[PDB]
């Protein structure tokens, strides 16, 4: 039986750590809500 706990405000952070790339991927989405990669 699940419960929630507040963790913060939703706000943009002016000087945040910046990371991650920007892949462009062909995907499929099935009826179960699962993504898969196409080639």
């Amino acid at each position: 039986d699940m419960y929630i706990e507040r963790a913060g405000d939703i706000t943009w952070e002016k000087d945040a750590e910046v990371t991650g790339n920007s892949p462009r991927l062909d995907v499929a989405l099935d009826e179960s809500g699962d993504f898969s990669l196409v080639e």
Partner: protein, 154 residues
Amino acid sequence: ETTDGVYRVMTRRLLGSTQVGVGVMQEGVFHTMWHVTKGAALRSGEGRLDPYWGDVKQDLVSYCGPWKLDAAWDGLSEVQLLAVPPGERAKNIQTLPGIFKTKDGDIGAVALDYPAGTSGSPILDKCGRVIGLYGNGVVIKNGSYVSAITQGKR
């Protein structure tokens, strides 16, 4: 507590207290990913949050009212993931989304890896609006994780 913000979704049903996911309280509605709660009711202090809307294929669910989150990635600008990892303080992480191309259109995706239990963490634009939720995605050749920017409809 109904105040807007980001929340952890916890359970005591396992060893200790376990974070199963994250979600967004906005305009009195709690928003998370379907796979976090499987649509079950939630406790908020003494209160009960009942499910209101959900869809397994979109992998989204709202509580206490209809889905409220409208904003969409602009397709051009960096965004921030407000990651709330288990046992760890909320942290903003800025990134330029990539794209999931599907038969039914393109959606943004963020190439950021966080532990199980971070699903539902919100992705924000520079205005602070939630443009979707993190935690439904793919595992790529590199073995890393790429999450869709999953947004509902208001």
